[PDB]
Symmetry: C3
Subunit: 339 residues, 3 copies
């Protein structure tokens, strides 16, 4: 909701409240857990007309969790998701710096359209696949105006040496190219980065360099949404050995994402998706599957502000999973207000 | 303050800044402590007209403390208080899920009108008496329109198995009935819930089931506010043995709340209240009083935005208190801006 | 950006997003560190016309850091900076209580005009030099209207006995006098406060009383900003022995701040500043320099919303520094959106 629009400066303050609950059995071995998952979000998107050819913009977004008590754990789960400012200039393109999605997410976010879950490979603080701190991203749209619907981007990932091996990264560079023609859109993205010595000093994952590339195809027209993603990572997908409490990254993963959705004119939006990410040559185990499930979901939009949804995950992970990944199903039911 | 009101969607962004200070002697043994208690709050209340008979709504509220440093403890005290969305439909009633007050608070919040203190029995994360996470609440007003001023509600309290015994709960169900006629209002509420094994594995409090019921009467007309509350709990009121640092819940409490206030036409709003909650059959001690005080207070409202207040607690707890509950008085002085 | 302005009540909701990066070598021994420093801020300033002569006001401000992950450390760096409400009455003056700047900052904030750094002596939770919790401040402007441009203030600093020795303080009183005539402004400020027993039970810093006074001169006209500050502290400047991990305060400091800036009409705003704070009679070491650097910086303002800057610190601290204070330079590059 727009709050100020004078001097060619618009500031849209937005947010939402999501009453959410996950249902599972026992949910220690659940895919997505069990219990109250209510949360809220707040943010703003500002845009200012510097001149005829230049425009400045800033974006912030925060996630306040609502499933926590008012005592010791009240702060659990709260996170800054977006924090970046930049300039959009003429037909040259755009540059921004701060916390933002990696360029691999340009192609990876194609199948991240599921009501509650989906995009399991878009980890936060995982180089290029998800939201990361300190990324300079140059994005050019319509290739300088000469070639319509043909966009690309290049990103410089800065060294983020956090105390955690999982949330750390080194210096990197990535890019993506997309092409959106008559309903369709096909994307390729790639990124490489140095690994921190803490990352390298881990039992799982061997290498002095991380790689993430992903390709995507989507159809978005005539009330149909259909997407497909394929990605491979090298020492860049976080894993955890449940049996030995061992962290680290998978030496290699092959990731497949599918989504098919039709939005009814009266509100109901059923969803069919599939997700399978299998690791290869993990230390002590070899090949394992990180995620494998079929999703059946539906969202009912009353209007643009209010909606409810159900998201059913039919977990195809087996109870023989060597990494101790959960094998049980998870059903998510939510009611969402947003502005 | 309303920020957007188009397409039959209103979003009221509100908040306040409260400069607050508690005065006490020594305040280790104070009732309410001693020192700076400044805090701020932010929230929004959105409401959308889905159709002629249906309306969606979301509410979020947060408490940013202002008495903390900018260093290590900057996050202390911050909490999400409200986070819930729901639908109000026609004369059927309303349903919402998220973090919200329990149904016992329907009758308990009658005497929670004191400037700074009061409602000492409305503990957060305490089943039905205060704000709790993951509550589905169906509330019906004017009994389907047939019987005016006669409202009731039913709530399903979901399992919240936090790491803390104090902030945890099991599966529960509660309800309330109220009747508001010509200035008056009388309420009865009740709720029961399973206790977690962590709760059950506590020195203080014995039982595999928690109970909380409360009745209330208020008069709110002719610039007079007068309220009375009586409540009983079973294994559902948090206690702490100061001498042995022992947590747990009181096996039984009998809780009495009284409030009398008159709002002068020119701003001053004196307050007279009384609070006594005594525990029974506590392990190792037996009967003890959790709170016992007389309150003398006054708030001066300049207008609807600005106000100051003084709240004096005349603590009737004695220095022989077996649980080590404080016996000293506490004076609260505050200055409040809100929008 | 103003969001509501009815019934003589204006509420300005403001904030910013700052993409920021510090560059250094190795930055363990850097002056300002090394890596992503992106952050965002949110706040509101409300003002209500109580009557013809009286006005109420509240101010809140928060700093959400953007350089943190979405995991364990997501909350790191977040702090409430402002939280205070008060009354401005006629020509008598103003009173407010809450978290706010100390009165020494009245004169100290003269040289705190640098793009990213500067005002190194305005520590938070350090009595009167920076932002502190629980301060009652009476400020009078134009000396009751009789003497134009002649302002003064008196502040009562309340006991803040935090668990940290660094973030604690005792009872204190401070004041300031300023005089702003035809572009110029000259200020004197002083404050004294009791030290906590925790503060007194520290290896570094000896005394049962803290002192902070500072004088200032600024010229702010004809697109020129030039400021000079001198301050002395007694047991009131936080120090840390890097070699022995020893905290405490400097027995005495002499602090010098200089700033010279010219704002070009087309946007560029170069900056020249100097900062030197040397400690005296520190336990085990004697005299040391806390900070010593020359700054060369420039900010380019596109408009009132958007800007970028570079801030170069030429660190004059030497690698023989007895306290282990960093000797390397630090370059800060930032891009800022605000509303
Ligand atoms: Zn963004
Ligand atoms: Zn609510
Ligand atoms: Zn302020």
């Amino acid at each position: 909701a727009e709050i100020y629009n004078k001097d060619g400066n618009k500031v849209d303050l937005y947010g939402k409240a999501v009453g959410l609950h996950y249902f599972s059995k026992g949910g220690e071995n659940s895919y997505g857990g069990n219990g109250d998952m209510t949360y809220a979000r707040l943010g703003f998107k500002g845009e200012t007309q510097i001149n005829s050819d230049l425009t400045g913009y800033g974006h912030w977004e925060y996630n306040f969790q609502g499933n926590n008590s008012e005592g010791a754990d009240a702060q659990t789960g709260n996170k800054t998701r977006h924090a970046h400012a930049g300039l959009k200039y003429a037909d040259v393109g755009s540059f921004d710096y701060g916390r933002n999605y990696g360029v691999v997410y340009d192609a990876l976010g194609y199948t991240d359209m599921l009501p509650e879950f989906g995009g399991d490979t878009a980890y936060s603080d995982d180089f290029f696949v998800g939201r990361v701190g300190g990324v300079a991203t140059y994005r050019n749209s319509n290739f300088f105006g000469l070639v319509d619907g043909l966009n690309f981007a290049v990103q410089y990932l800065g060294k983020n040496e956090r105390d955690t091996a999982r949330r750390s990264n080194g210096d990197g560079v990535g890019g993506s190219i997309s092409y959106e023609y008559e309903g369709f859109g096909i994307v390729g993205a790639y990124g490489a980065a140095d690994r921190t010595n803490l990352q390298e000093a881990q039992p799982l994952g061997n290498g002095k360099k991380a790689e993430q590339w992903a390709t995507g195809l989507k159809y978005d027209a005539n009330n149909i949404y259909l997407a497909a993603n394929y990605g491979e990572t090298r020492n860049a997908t976080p894993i955890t050995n449940k049996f030995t409490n061992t962290s680290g990254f998978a030496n290699k993963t092959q990731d497949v994402l599918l989504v098919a959705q039709y939005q009814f004119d009266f509100g109901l939006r059923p969803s069919i998706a599939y997700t399978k990410s299998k690791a290869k040559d993990v230390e002590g185990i070899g090949d394992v599957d990180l995620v494998n499930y079929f999703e059946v979901g539906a969202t009912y939009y009353f209007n643009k502000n209010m909606s409810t949804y159900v998201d059913y995950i039919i977990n195809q992970i087996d109870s023989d999973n060597k990494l101790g990944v959960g094998s049980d199903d998870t059903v998510a039911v939510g009611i969402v207000y947003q502005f």
